[PDB]
Structure 1
Amino acid sequence: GANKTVVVTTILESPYVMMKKNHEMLEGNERYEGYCVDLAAEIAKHCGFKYKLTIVGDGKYGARDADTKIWNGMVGELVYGKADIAIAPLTITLVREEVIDFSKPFMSLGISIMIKKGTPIESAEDLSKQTEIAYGTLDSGSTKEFFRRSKIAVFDKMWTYMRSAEPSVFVRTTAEGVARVRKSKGKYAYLLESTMNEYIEQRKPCDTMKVGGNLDSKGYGIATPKGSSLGNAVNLAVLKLNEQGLLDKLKNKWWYDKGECGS
């Protein structure tokens, strides 16, 4: 049939997609900025489609409710036919891969530790061997799952603590985790993806730090409905853009050129 505008679903997560400060004055795709806004433009160019950016209606990434079996978030919008492509920091996982198609990674990352500067923690082992400093993860996401699935003693000890800690150590969003680190006076550490951690470390008030190495190695992928004809071209575009350096150019633009914490 005739071509139609492609509906892109994405999520407000800095610096991937942000409302421009003057968005009330703008319309359409021009309302948004960030790494994934720039990536969407490049993918559309390299696949030859016109597109409309939309923010996922429920504000969520995508998980399946254990009781109703309904997918929420961006994954749900793809699964149920409400969007054509998701361009966001959507971690490639087994459970999602079974229901949607993913490009090869456009960004690589791993689980990492965020502290308020001066917190006496250098490693996951340090967290696991003390109790004064609480620590947790995003409540719905791949970081929590790493701990749930681990057979490594340190990470098992961490999961046993986190899963039962009161008050809850799990947070609703990255912004909530960061705020909790910043406001808990060194008594909360946040486990999150290295990409977000490294971004926040270069944001005012410049009071957080990434500590230690990454605990694993994963990727973000562009997602399409399973079997969608768009997936092949999107995947080729990701590889081509990576090979020509464009993805690293965008990362440097949004993480470091725009850093607020010095050079």
Structure 2
Amino acid sequence: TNRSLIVTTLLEEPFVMFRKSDRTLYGNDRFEGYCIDLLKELAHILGFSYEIRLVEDGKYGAQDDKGQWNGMVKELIDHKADLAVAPLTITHVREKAIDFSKPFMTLGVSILYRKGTPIDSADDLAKQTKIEYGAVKDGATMTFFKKSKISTFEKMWAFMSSKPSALVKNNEEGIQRTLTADYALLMESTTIEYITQRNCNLTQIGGLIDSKGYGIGTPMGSPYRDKITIAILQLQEEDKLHIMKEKWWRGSGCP
């Protein structure tokens, strides 16, 4: 098979971003970031070409009450894309719809909040309402709380899903909310690490709530899944993914 693979993705710093230039850019040249470096490395190793496209609805992917998916997950289900290359969380619920490569990065859910009120955990959030909290709508973190059998997280989901402001359109909007309101954002730990190094009034609250990985998504039965997995595992063993992360995360710290 010689054709270029269609890659669906989402803007999400520092994984996928619009490259800065004075020229009007087009095609793959528009994009840079951790996930673009990973895609280039896989493309080199495995000898394939690709065309990157932004998912129209700007969502990662979750199910509605009818069971229908949206976001990048839906793109893969409909075979509108060959690969989803993004910080896409590997979950068993999504495995009902799509396949994933093995993880290229591990992480956990944690809390992003303004330094100030010394809350120390999700339990501190769960037992009150003065500090509002939420997550990105139709993402893995939202779904984690929605499906949780943990009593504290159930309480949190009950509040989140009743407060129409709590679930934000995207990470950026969630971060802005933490900066402008008494609001704590439930979000993934490596992104929190990135944010708190650049926004010194924000901090991570508590440790990791859980453990998971980001993987490259594919339609079920993709002929590319297995070779992508092998290449990712190799890059991981040779510490190439650690170096790639250091590349995109490094910068000046905070006082």
Q: What is the TM-score when the length of structure 1 is the normalising length?
A: 0.90
Q: How many residue pairs were aligned? A: 255
Gaps of 5+ in 1: none
Are 2:253 and 1:254 equivalent residues in the alignment?
A: no
Offset at residue 262 of structure 1 (A): 4.4
Aligned equivalents of 1:148, 1:70: Cα separation in 2: 16
The residue aligned with 1:42 is: 41
When residues 33 and 206 of structure 1 are mapped into structure 2, their CA distance, relative to the original with a 3 A threshold, is: same
**2:192 aligned with 1:197:** yes
Partner Cα distance (2:71, 2:65) in 1: 15
Work out whether residues 62 and 140 of structure 2, in 8 Å CA contact, stay in contact via their aligned partners in 1.
no
Aligned residue among 217, 220, 244 for 2:214: 220
Deviation string for 1:12-47 (max 9, x for gaps)?
A: 011100001227533322211100010000111121
The alpha-carbon distance between structure 1 residues 182 and 56, as it changes in their structure 2 partners (threshold 3 A), is same
Matches for 1:94-105 after TM superposition, within 5 Å: 94-105=92-103
24-33 or 237-246, which moves further after superposition? 24-33
Q: Secondary structure at the match of 1:164?
A: coil
- Which residue does the alignment assign to 1:75? 73
Percent identical across equivalent pairs?
A: 53
Given candidates 176, 179, 194, the residue that maps to 2:176 is 179
1:135 Cα offset (Å): 0.9
Cα RMSD for the two superposed structures: 1.8
Q: How many Å apart are 1:97 and its aligned residue?
A: 1.1
Shift of 1:212: 0.9
Q: Contact between 1:224 and 1:231, CA under 8 Å: does it hold in 2? A: yes
From 112, 115, 127, the equivalent of 1:114 is 112
Report the counterpart of residue 144 of structure 2 in structure 1: 146
**Could you tell which deviates more after superposition, 7-16 or 50-59?**
50-59
| More moved, 140-149 vs 47-56 | 140-149
1:245 maps to which residue?
A: 239
Query: What amino acid is aligned across from residue 182 of structure 1 in structure 2?
Result: L
Letter in 1 for 2:253: C
Shift of 1:248: 0.9
Q: Distance in 1 between matches of 2:107 and 2:113?
A: 18
| Superposed displacement of residue 157, structure 1 | 2.4
Point out where structure 2 has 5 or more consecutive residues left out of the alignment. Answer: none
1:3 alignment counterpart: 2
2:201 matched to 1:207?
yes
> How far did residue 200 of structure 1 move?
0.7
Secondary structure of the structure 1 residue equivalent to 2:192: helix
Q: C-alpha distance in 2, partners of 1:149/1:80?
A: 25
Shift of 1:122: 1.2
Distance 1:226 1:154 in 2: 34
Change (3 A) 1:23 1:46: farther
1:169 aligned onto 2:166: yes
1:234 to 225, 228, 250: 228
Structure 2 CA distance for partners of 1:123 and 1:23, relative to 1, 3 Å:
farther
Report the equivalent of 1:30: 29
Alpha carbons of structure 1 residues 23 and 207: separation in structure 2 relative to 1, 3 Å: farther
- Counterpart residue type for residue 9 of structure 1: T
C-alpha distance in 2 between matches for 1:239 and 1:85: 17
Instruction: Write the distance in 2 (CA, Å) between the matches of 1:149 and 1:65.
Output: 13
Q: Distance in 2 between matches of 1:97 and 1:152?
A: 22
User: TM-score, normalised to structure 2's length?
Assistant: 0.93
